Ligand binder design. Structure first.
Ligand SMILES: CCCCCCCC(O)C[C@H]1O[C@@](CO)(O[C@H]2O[C@H](CO)[C@@H](O)[C@H](O)[C@H]2O)[C@@H](O)[C@@H]1O
Length: 371
């Protein structure tokens, strides 16, 4: 089990970037979805463009040969897609290539082999049809969670890359709908609304960490998955965010001490949309997003470069479990206007696959959106 330790650090790194831009908006993204897409793309990149990408994903070529990295992803992806009898989890990569655009064989085979990618040739001259195919791919993979992902597509498009992840799990310790109650929340500084709050009194695998300055709760999903929640102490949100690390989570995953407690978890339906260019730029990956981008490993008759890279994720939480989807489109997609209002006691969460110890999703909940 390799590359998962890097994937984890990549998560926190990316999380911290989004976290220090605002502290009053909900956050949600899939490290796996983002890492798989850029890792696969690097196979067609060269020089700095290439090195910046793998390095920006928390990979150092001096510690692990590139061959093993692309290899670690191939196995990770194979393991994540292995059918689990108790939960649903799937990830897929798709390439939509322009008919008439000459490509590099080596690239087509590296992706299909290493990232189990699917290659589709489409006519981008028929923009409505090209979008439909892409959108049908994501909607099929996200089981209806994300439909009509791409609203507009450039006429001159010749290459498109999309990644999707889907997860649905049931709490081993579910809540009771009868115990859910409407509660007051300040939508703005001057008006409140009632939102559904789930409640349950019993034994929980809770604990408190000094280094993180917060309470840590573990919510197992039937299957090989788990959800860890972090409730920062007063004024210690920023502290939690910067202190989260792979090891810490490890020291907490090996604690079977459960105590009695009254859990209050709001019914949630959150989303997250981000143009990763600036954010990933902050991690060292900038060349591929510039004109000096070298992706001559994809095609030799087009000056490929990433102009935009939007990540979209949706997560629903209720009494019985969790359902979440994520998609990565390496092009333009509209941004949303998240509502900004902190209900004083925000929390961070991380959804993890016990089989590979990989972080499927990570977020921050400050607003009880029901969207
Ligand atoms: C790791 C723990 C994760 C649990 C996170 C719970 C977040 C909330 O739901 C917080 C929210 O619930 C209320 C309800 O009154 O607070 C109660 O529950 C929290 C649970 O931690 C208690 O600490 C509070 O004392 C309770 O009042 C909201 O007021 C609160 O903001």
């Amino acid at each position: 089990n390799k590359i998962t330790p890097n994937l984890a650090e990549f998560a926190f790194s990316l999380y911290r970037q989004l976290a220090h831009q605002s502290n009053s908006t909900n956050i949600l993204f899939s490290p796996v979805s983002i890492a798989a897409a850029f890792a696969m793309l690097s196979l067609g990149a060269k020089g700095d463009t290439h090195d910046e990408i793998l390095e920006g994903l928390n990979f150092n070529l001096t510690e692990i040969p590139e061959a093993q990295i692309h290899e670690g992803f191939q196995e990770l992806l194979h393991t994540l897609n292995q059918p689990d009898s108790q939960l649903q989890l799937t990830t897929g990569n798709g390439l939509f290539l322009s008919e008439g655009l000459k490509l590099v064989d080596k690239f087509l085979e590296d992706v299909k082999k290493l990232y189990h990618s699917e290659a589709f040739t489409v006519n981008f001259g028929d923009t409505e049809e090209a979008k439909k195919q892409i959108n049908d791919y994501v909607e099929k993979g996200t089981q209806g969670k994300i439909v009509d992902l791409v609203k507009e597509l450039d006429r001159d498009t010749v290459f498109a890359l999309v990644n999707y992840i889907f997860f649905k799990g049931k709490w081993e310790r579910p809540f009771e709908v009868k115990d859910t109650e409407e509660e007051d929340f300040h939508v703005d500084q001057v008006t409140t609304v009632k939102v559904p709050m789930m409640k349950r009194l019993g034994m929980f695998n809770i604990q408190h960490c000094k280094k993180l300055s917060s309470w840590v709760l573990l919510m197992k999903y039937l299957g090989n998955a788990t959800a860890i929640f972090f409730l920062p102490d007063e004024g210690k949100l920023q502290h939690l965010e910067n202190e989260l690390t792979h090891d810490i989570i490890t020291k907490f995953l090996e604690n079977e001490d459960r105590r009695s407690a009254s859990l209050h978890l709001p019914k949630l339906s959150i989303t997250g949309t981000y143009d990763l260019k600036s954010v990933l730029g902050q991690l060292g990956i900038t060349k591929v997003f510039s004109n000096g981008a070298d992706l001559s490993g994809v095609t030799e008759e087009a000056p490929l470069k990433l102009s935009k890279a939007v990540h979209k994720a949706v997560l629903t939480i209720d009494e019985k479990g969790t359902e979440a989807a994520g998609a990565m489109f390496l092009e333009a997609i509209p941004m949303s206007i998240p509502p900004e209002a902190k209900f004083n006691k925000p929390f961070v969460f991380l959804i993890i696959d016990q089989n590979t110890k990989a972080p499927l999703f990570m977020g921050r909940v400050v607003n009880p959106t029901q969207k």
